[PDB]
Ligand binder design. Structure first.
Ligand SMILES: [Zn+2]
Lengths: 114, 57
């Protein structure tokens, strides 16, 4: 059967319902059975999630290490002689000439004495 | 891209260069009396020149 304009209440087909434009006001129910009532995800959308864009995501609790190095906490307090992360003074730098020694000036401050 | 996103990762991250943030004046702090040495009792850090410290007596 062939028409111009089919005006109906309900339409139901046992094979393809093709159209070079499909228009779903009010509801869409997919092949699994989820009944959408708003706009849908285009492929390659991910840019939207990035800083300040619409539908931004939290990184809180996500896993793995980044290819790029990151600003850490202020974390000097994480190092000590007792910890698995270890640094020793014989590894450390100084501007002082040969036979110079680190000595305290008071006022929290170290210096190269002799 | 993760650039400009917010939150704390469950796995720790390889840090940016940050030695300056361990200064006497910075917003976090470490002191020499906290630090290790392999040197025996009464050994003292002494400079050999060439930027480098050593455990002498
Ligand atoms: Zn660090």
């Amino acid at each position: 059967h062939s028409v111009d304009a089919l005006n109906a209440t309900t339409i139901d087909a046992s094979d393809t319902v093709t159209g070079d434009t499909v228009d779903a006001t009010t509801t869409l129910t997919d092949a699994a059975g989820v009944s959408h009532t708003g706009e849908l995800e285009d492929i390659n959308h991910g840019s939207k999630h990035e800083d300040g864009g619409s539908d931004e995501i939290s990184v809180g609790g996500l896993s793995g290490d980044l290819a790029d190095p990151q600003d850490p906490k202020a974390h000097a307090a994480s190092h000590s002689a007792d910890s698995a992360d270890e640094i020793s003074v014989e590894n450390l730098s100084t501007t002082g000439s040969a036979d110079t020694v680190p000595i305290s000036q008071g006022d929290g401050t170290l210096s190269m004495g002799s």
